[PDB]
Amino acid sequence: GSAMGSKPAKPLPKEMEEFVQSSGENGVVVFSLGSMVSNMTEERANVIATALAKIPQKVLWRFDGNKPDALGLNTRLYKWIPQNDLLGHPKTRAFITHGGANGIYEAIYHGIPMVGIPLFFDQPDNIAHMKAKGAAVRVDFNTMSSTDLLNALKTVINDPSYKENIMKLSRIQH
Amino acid sequence: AKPLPKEMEEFVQSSGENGVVVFSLGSMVSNMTEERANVIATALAKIPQKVLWRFDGNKPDALGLNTRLYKWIPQNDLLGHPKTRAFITHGGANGIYEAIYHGIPMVGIPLFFDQPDNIAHMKAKGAAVRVDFNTMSSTDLLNALKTVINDPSYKENIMKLSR
């Protein structure tokens, strides 16, 4: 019973696990665009915040800018997230991601369907293969409206075809 | 509710009282030259810790029996494991936050972007040593690892930053 402890650390930090548990039946959504667009224009952050505020899920958003004016009560901002641990949490319903390789692998591993928002580099191709397999919907960061993002979210969270398609990939992967 | 994939967990537990080291240069090091992979593998093979290396290229000839390659690692789960002794990282912000949160000292190998300044800050705080990916020899990397594992000031300094 030392100060460090001799057991593996808890999956989620203290307040974060309480926030996830408070989602009840609706569950949560993980939102991370990676380090390179954790800061963004006020206009883009409010488009996103407005969409996220309209789903009944709780939302964990990796974000470091100024708090958006339209941030919903269901949404919390985090400078960092234990992404794999959130994706493996039983409450998690969807992953909004830029489509990096580590994130897609964790999404497939844990069977979490995606809203893909590719920005740079391999990310457009990474999401294209997920969209092909029915495990993701794709939206365009620069031009998406709040309703565009909200519809993508509602689709991936509630239409089970996305969950089932990524579970097919999950069951091969492990 | 298990942080590590089964086979990865068995490897981590197999480290006994030596513990493990987590090595990840992130997404932008997809692959590297044979020459660099052998320099790294040679160094990693010479510590008593077991080593989990995020790596997706050709298996290095010099890969030690203490070292395993993974296309993907659960980085926060490994850093939170009681066996973990050090984190060799490119210096991405998320990894550094996790290392600070779990009290794990770092060998920083910054490559691009914010990574040089991220690692420079950790080194200034005594929580990291810094090496150069393109220049480092096997001895350089081995000495850095030995330092941050065996000199406790690095772990103690990063635990200060924790709170």
UniProtKB/Swiss-Prot annotation, chain B:
This is UDP-glucuronosyltransferase 2B10. Belongs to the UDP-glycosyltransferase family. It comes from the Eukaryota. It is found in: Microsome membrane; Endoplasmic reticulum membrane. The chain holds residues 284 to 446 of 528 of the full protein. Glycans are attached at N31. UDPGT is of major importance in the conjugation and subsequent elimination of potentially toxic xenobiotics and endogenous compounds.
